[PDB]
Design a protein around this ligand. Sequence first.
Ligand SMILES: Nc1ncnc2c1ncn2[C@@H]1O[C@H](C(=O)N2CCN(CC(=O)Nc3cccc4c3CNC4=O)CC2)[C@@H](O)[C@H]1O
Ligand SMILES: [Zn+2]
Length: 207
Amino acid sequence: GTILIDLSPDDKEFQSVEEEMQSTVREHRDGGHAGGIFNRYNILKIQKVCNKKLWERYTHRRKEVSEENHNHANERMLFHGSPFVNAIIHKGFDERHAYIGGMFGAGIYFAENSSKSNQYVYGIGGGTGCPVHKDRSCYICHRQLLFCRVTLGKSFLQFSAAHSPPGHHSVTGRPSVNGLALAEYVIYRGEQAYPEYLITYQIMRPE
Ligand SMILES: Nc1ncnc2c1ncn2[C@@H]1O[C@H](C(=O)N2CCN(CC(=O)Nc3cccc4c3CNC4=O)CC2)[C@@H](O)[C@H]1O
Ligand SMILES: [Zn+2]
């Protein structure tokens, strides 16, 4: 069921998505070890992801969350990086693949910082880098991120240095040390996210 529609760079949606991508880059505490060294991206393509089945599954779960939370879905647009981006656009997010814990347990993780999600494109901690050059800071190979619509509902606030918590629909990882970091979020149901844009890009070598 999935089709990908290419957005023209003149399209206002292309521009607003690119801007969210570029404006949410930050420096990382690993000095670029996992995701490479860059201050900005070269955006090659932005595709709208269209799948009726996945979308209806999302909206159904969204209405359920909403009715449990005074008609407030608490919906965000957030980044997701993964080696399995092709499976996600075709089959949706699936929480059964969330074995190993990150900071907030076995769940599906999303980031406000595009550069944080970029650290996971080639695997946990960047894995071994691009498949062609084995370089976590490769400037040649094309990368992809998803920009996703995520239902947070009532989110458990975790100050920060499986199931949702009882009475909650998600977890929010609030940074409590690094003053420039944006939040990360965790959901425990795959139907609480819809992978709306597929962005293909390169990281750019600083001048
Ligand atoms: N349909 C599917 N087929 C194959 N893999 C699928 C899938 N749906 C989700 N996944 C994948 O399962 C994986 C998963 O849940 N995991 C593995 C990693 N882990 C740590 C984590 O996600 N940290 C983390 C923290 C902050 C941002 C980002 C990430 C990952 N991507 C980001 O943008 C939490 C549990 C994940 O890598 C996801 O992409
Ligand atoms: Zn490469």
